[PDB]
Write an enzyme that holds these catalytic residues in place. Structure first.
Site, PDB file in Angstrom:
ATOM      1  N   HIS A 116      10.319 -26.214 -11.321  1.00 42.22           N
ATOM      2  CA  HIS A 116       9.282 -26.794 -10.472  1.00 42.22           C
ATOM      3  C   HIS A 116       8.974 -25.806  -9.356  1.00 42.22           C
ATOM      4  O   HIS A 116       9.823 -24.996  -8.975  1.00 42.22           O
ATOM      5  CB  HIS A 116       9.718 -28.136  -9.879  1.00 42.22           C
ATOM      6  N   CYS A 142       4.312 -24.805 -10.911  1.00 41.41           N
ATOM      7  CA  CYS A 142       3.181 -25.177 -10.059  1.00 41.41           C
ATOM      8  C   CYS A 142       3.231 -24.326  -8.788  1.00 41.41           C
ATOM      9  O   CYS A 142       4.295 -23.848  -8.394  1.00 41.41           O
ATOM     10  CB  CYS A 142       3.217 -26.664  -9.674  1.00 41.41           C
TER      11      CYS A 142
END
Lengths: 88, 173, 88, 173
Positions: free
Chosen positions: D113, D161
Site C-alpha cells: 500500500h 497508490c
C-alpha cells in the site's frame, strides 16, 4: 458524449541536479546546465528524442571536477518519443 | 548556414526525418503543419532578489534559452523577478492561452535560486519562504487545468540548487 | 589518491502511477502495473533499453477505461542505456 | 523453447547484440562475464497489514516478478510484511552484500500500500504512520552508502497508490 482521460500525461521535467545538491553558475558564462543543454539540443535535436538528449546531457557531466552536479529527469509520463524535427 | 530561423540548431534532413518514422512507427508525438501551428514557450527567470544574492549571469541563460526555443519554433514569453504567487498567476495565464489549441508541444523553463522544497520567488528568505513547488507547475499544466495541451508533450526545465550539498563522495582510484 | 564521484547517479525509478493517484490490483490476477511490466520485459528486454521499456509500458496504459492509471518514471540519473541482453 | 534459465523472456541473439553496440558506442552500461558475475535482486512485498486491508493477489506479483528477475540473471531475495524500520534494515543489509562488487546492476522492487508521501509498512495507520520514503531507498543505494554499486544501474520498481484520486478528467469526444 464524454470520454475519460489521464489527468497527468505527456510530461517531462529536466532538473539541473540530483536532490539535496547544488547547481552551479558562472558570472559571465551563465549556468553550466543551461549552456550544456543548449549545446546538446543544438547538436542532437535533429536525430534524438528529448529523453535521449537529456541522457546525453547527463553523460557529459559523468566526470566530475572542482564543481560537480548531476542533472536529473523527473516525473516522466511521455508515452511516445518526442522528436523536435528542427526545420520542420 | 546559421542565419536562418533555426540559427545554430542543426537541421533535420527529410531523409533522416522519414528514417526516424521507420525505426519507430506510431510511437512518436504527432507534429503539426509548420504553416498554421502556433507554438508557445515560457521562460521565468529570477535575477534580482530582495534578500538572497544576485544571480549574476542569468542574462546569458535568458539569451541562450530564448534563442534556442525560438530556433525550435516556439514563441518565447520571458518573465522576470516574480514571487511564487506571481509565477502561479503567469503559469495560470500561459495555461489559458488559445495558441495551445493550435500547438503540438510546449516548453516551460524556470531559472532561479532553489531549495530542497522548490523554486525561489524574488521575495524569498529563510524566515518568510517564497517557494514554487514542482508539484504546482505539473498541476497547473495537466489535463484538468490545461485541456488544450492534452496528449501533447510538456517539457519543464529547471535551473536551480535543490539543497546545499556539493553532491560528491570520495573513493580510492 | 582520492577521486571525486557523484553521490547519486545511475538510478531509475518506475512507479505504478502519477502522483496523487491510485494503482489497481486484481485479487486473482495481481497488480496491473506489475503484470504489464513482466509482459513487456519478457517481450522487449532483448531489443530495447529499460527506459524505453518503461515508456512502452506507459504507452499500453494510454487508453483508459473503468480503472485508470499512468505509470511514472522518477529520479532518472542514468548516463547510459541499460540493455539487459537476456541470455548473456 | 522456454524451459531454460530465461524462461518466458525472449533471448537476445548475438547478431542483434552486436548491432546494438553499433547504434550506440560507449553509451551502454558495461555487462559482466556470465561465468563469474553475482547479480542480486530484492523484492519487498507487504500483503498482511495490521489495520489496512489485505492485498489479495500480491502472491501472483511475487511469483511473477521473482521469476522474471531470475530470468534476467538475478538472485532474487524476497522479503515480506515488514515495517518501515524493518525495510530500512533490509535495504541497509542489501547495500552491504559483497556480491554487488562482482555485479553490474541491481533491481529493487517494492509492492505494498502507498500514500502521497511514501510506501506503507505492515503496521501503518492514519494515526500512527509507518511510511518508507522514496528518498530513503535512493539515499541507501547511492555512492556514499552503497559504493559497490557505483557507476552501475539501480532499478527501483514501486507498485502502490500515490494518493486517493482516480487520476482522470472527462472531455467531450
Amino acid at each position: 458524449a464524454i470520454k475519460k482521460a489521464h489527468i497527468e500525461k505527456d510530461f517531462i521535467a529536466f532538473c539541473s541536479s540530483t536532490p539535496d545538491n547544488v547547481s552551479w553558475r558562472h558570472p559571465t558564462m551563465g549556468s553550466v546546465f543551461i549552456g550544456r543543454l543548449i549545446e546538446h539540443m543544438q547538436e542532437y535535436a535533429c536525430s534524438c528524442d528529448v529523453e535521449e538528449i537529456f541522457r546525453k546531457v547527463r553523460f557529459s557531466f559523468e566526470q566530475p571536477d572542482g564543481r560537480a552536479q548531476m542533472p536529473t529527469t523527473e516525473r516522466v509520463t511521455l508515452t511516445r518519443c518526442f522528436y523536435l524535427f528542427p526545420g520542420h | 548556414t546559421s542565419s536562418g530561423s533555426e540559427g545554430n540548431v542543426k537541421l533535420c534532413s527529410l531523409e533522416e526525418a522519414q528514417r526516424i518514422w521507420k525505426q519507430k512507427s506510431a510511437e512518436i508525438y504527432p507534429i503539426m503543419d509548420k504553416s498554421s501551428r502556433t507554438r508557445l514557450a515560457l521562460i521565468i527567470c529570477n535575477e534580482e532578489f530582495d534578500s538572497i544574492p544576485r544571480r549574476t549571469g542569468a542574462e546569458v541563460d535568458i539569451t541562450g534559452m530564448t534563442m534556442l526555443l525560438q530556433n525550435l519554433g516556439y514563441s518565447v514569453d520571458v518573465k522576470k523577478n516574480l514571487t511564487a504567487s506571481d509565477m502561479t498567476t503567469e503559469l495560470e495565464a500561459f495555461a489559458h492561452r488559445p495558441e495551445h489549441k493550435t500547438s503540438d508541444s510546449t516548453f516551460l523553463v524556470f531559472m532561479s535560486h532553489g531549495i530542497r522544497e522548490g523554486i525561489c520567488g524574488k521575495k524569498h528568505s529563510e524566515q518568510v519562504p517564497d517557494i514554487l513547488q514542482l508539484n504546482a507547475i505539473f498541476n497547473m499544466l495537466n489535463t484538468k487545468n490545461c485541456p488544450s495541451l492534452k496528449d501533447k508533450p510538456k517539457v519543464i526545465i529547471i535551473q536551480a540548487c535543490r539543497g546545499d550539498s556539493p553532491g560528491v563522495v570520495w573513493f580510492k582510484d
